[PDB]
Structure 1
Amino acid sequence: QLIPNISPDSFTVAASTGMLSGKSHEMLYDAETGRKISQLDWKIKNVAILKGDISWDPYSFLTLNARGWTSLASGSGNMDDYDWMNENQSEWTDHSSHPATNVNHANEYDLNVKGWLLQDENYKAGITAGYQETRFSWTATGGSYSYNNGAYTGNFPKGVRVIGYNQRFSMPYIGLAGQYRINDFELNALFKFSDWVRAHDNDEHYMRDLTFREKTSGSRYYGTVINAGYYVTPNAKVFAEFTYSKYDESIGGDAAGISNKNYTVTAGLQYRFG
């Protein structure tokens, strides 16, 4: 006991468990006018996740880090599907609702380096660069629909898959990293940024016998990771961690939009091996 034991050339392993929530958008625009034609909102309500982190400090100023998380199994979601079929009307004309939407899986990994530019007894600050990929998959089942401004309504067959959807975001990124420590308490914060996001999606409209594929390049991402922990021993830190990620926006170029926001909240244990 005392303060944390941090030796040269040491490494850490951490695992945490908790929840993922968020919302993705799947967009179709009229490439000619920029007008939005379709928008599907895909919610992630509660998905249980397991998250891991391994870090190695080969030098006092350099950290190498591999981290990731995965859904433990499918989780709960929701999907709402809007179309603006009337160019002479601002409100959408069609809305389908699918409360019975499953989040089949979600995962992420992030490989990065941190270079510490400022270091003292209680504070650390540096820059980070890395590569990250995140994937989400949903299946919307059953549900109801209102078409033509509510003139026509009805239900999809209960439990039958209607639309399958998956997204993938891949990017190199850069960022800033900070740490504050007093006694046995430690706070880490990271801010991440990219203007180089590559996004892909696949959509299966099972009842229409249609499949869509969209891709966009050069979009923006912002993310943060905040971790607050307590060293119960000099080598073992129990912690809670919050992350937030925003990915800004057959189908290409000006017709496509693919976006996501998500957050995670987890708790776990980090151990440092001298």
Structure 2
Amino acid sequence: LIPNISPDSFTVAASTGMLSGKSHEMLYDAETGRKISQLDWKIKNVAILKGDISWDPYSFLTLNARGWTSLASGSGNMDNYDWMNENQSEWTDHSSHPATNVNHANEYDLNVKGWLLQDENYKAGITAGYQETRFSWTATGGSYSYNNGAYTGNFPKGVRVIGYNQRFSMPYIGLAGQYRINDFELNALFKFSDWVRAHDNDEHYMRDLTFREKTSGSRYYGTVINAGYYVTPNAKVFAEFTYSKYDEGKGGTQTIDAAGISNKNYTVTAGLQYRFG
């Protein structure tokens, strides 16, 4: 059958707000599993713009493209701990880099929703999609405690020390629900994957080393919740909260195992949704 092309089958949304979260760049001894290295990359505050395009070609089927992107460089933090001494549990080395920027971040999520239950107030379905999320940081300056506190001091202000990028991609499955009572509307979504593929890239500028890691078959959990009010029949003002957790996977390391790549993130935004027609 020929999909619905009526203007009212089409809805667009945009919101703005903030993204925050934390990533981990991990290294383990591939024999004992002993954690030898851990860099924690913080996303403290990044302004984002979030977009959504949704089309209902059929009553039971919605096609959706959504994502968000950083509006400018944001603030972050990085800490780098290393366990060089196999005998000792405490770390031998630590550097701290408060002057770490989140250069950019984004996410894209292309999905379908198959609506299986519906009445006047409630629509519920199964969703499946493809999603990718990327973050980029640059750590500059900072301080260090090396070789069990034998060497301590600071790195030169503004000098870039480590550059780091992560990306996670996956197909996911989920449950989506939509409640509408008069002018109030609530949407809730729960997403999951058991097959995340992750990559990262690390430029150690003071060692002229580039590291690359990749893992596959790791888990993801995500939620989306939004609530809003229709101020016209076609226009809804709303707020939205999202949470995503990319569990650590186990994979290989490259220098130009065993590596772990992980992330959690949150967004809080507010905006407007508009249905045509």
The alignment's TM-score, normalised by the length of structure 1, stands at 0.95
- Following the alignment from structure 1 to structure 2, what is the Cα–Cα distance between the partners of residues 60 and 36? 52
Change (3 A) 1:138 1:166: same
Is the contact between residue 12 and residue 53 of structure 2 (CA under 8 Å) also seen in structure 1? yes
Change (3 A) 1:39 1:46: same
1:265 corresponding residue in structure 2: 268
Change (3 A) 1:117 1:8: farther
Change (3 A) 1:242 1:5: farther
The range that moved more, 94-103 or 83-92, is 83-92
Taking only aligned residues, the RMSD between alpha carbons, in angstroms, comes to: 3.5
- Following the alignment from structure 1 to structure 2, what is the Cα–Cα distance between the partners of residues 183 and 108? 32
Change (3 A) 1:250 1:134: closer
SS at match of 1:9: helix
Change (3 A) 1:227 1:233: same
Change (3 A) 1:4 1:149: farther
- Following the alignment from structure 1 to structure 2, what is the Cα–Cα distance between the partners of residues 257 and 242? 27
Is the contact between residue 138 and residue 160 of structure 2 (CA under 8 Å) also seen in structure 1? yes
How far has the Cα of 1:148 moved from its partner? 2.3
Cα deviations by residue, 1:54-78 (Å, 9 ceiling, x for unpaired): 0001111111000010001110000
How far has the Cα of 1:100 moved from its partner? 0.1
How far has the Cα of 1:173 moved from its partner? 0.6
SS at match of 2:156: coil
How far has the Cα of 1:39 moved from its partner? 0.4
SS at match of 2:250: coil
- Following the alignment from structure 2 to structure 1, what is the Cα–Cα distance between the partners of residues 209 and 7? 57
Cα deviations by residue, 1:122-171 (Å, 9 ceiling, x for unpaired): 11111000000100000000000011222321111100000000001011
- Following the alignment from structure 1 to structure 2, what is the Cα–Cα distance between the partners of residues 195 and 157? 43
SS at match of 1:234: coil
- Tell whether 2:136 aligns with 1:137: yes
Is the contact between residue 228 and residue 241 of structure 1 (CA under 8 Å) also seen in structure 2? yes
Is the contact between residue 113 and residue 129 of structure 1 (CA under 8 Å) also seen in structure 2? yes
How far has the Cα of 1:86 moved from its partner? 1.3
How far has the Cα of 1:90 moved from its partner? 1.3
Is the contact between residue 45 and residue 76 of structure 1 (CA under 8 Å) also seen in structure 2? yes
- Following the alignment from structure 1 to structure 2, what is the Cα–Cα distance between the partners of residues 157 and 188? 49
Is the contact between residue 212 and residue 251 of structure 1 (CA under 8 Å) also seen in structure 2? no
How far has the Cα of 1:273 moved from its partner? 1.1
Change (3 A) 1:151 1:109: same
How far has the Cα of 1:9 moved from its partner? 6.0
- Following the alignment from structure 2 to structure 1, what is the Cα–Cα distance between the partners of residues 13 and 250? 40
2:71 corresponding residue in structure 1: 72
Change (3 A) 1:57 1:250: closer
The range that moved more, 155-164 or 81-90, is 81-90
Is the contact between residue 137 and residue 165 of structure 1 (CA under 8 Å) also seen in structure 2? yes
How far has the Cα of 1:224 moved from its partner? 0.3
- Following the alignment from structure 2 to structure 1, what is the Cα–Cα distance between the partners of residues 3 and 241? 22
Change (3 A) 1:195 1:112: same
Structure 2, unpaired ranges of 5+:
none
SS at match of 1:208: coil
- Following the alignment from structure 1 to structure 2, what is the Cα–Cα distance between the partners of residues 6 and 225? 27
How far has the Cα of 1:121 moved from its partner? 1.0
Structure 1, unpaired ranges of 5+:
none
Q: How many residues align?
A: 273
1:99 corresponding residue in structure 2: 98
- Following the alignment from structure 1 to structure 2, what is the Cα–Cα distance between the partners of residues 51 and 160? 32
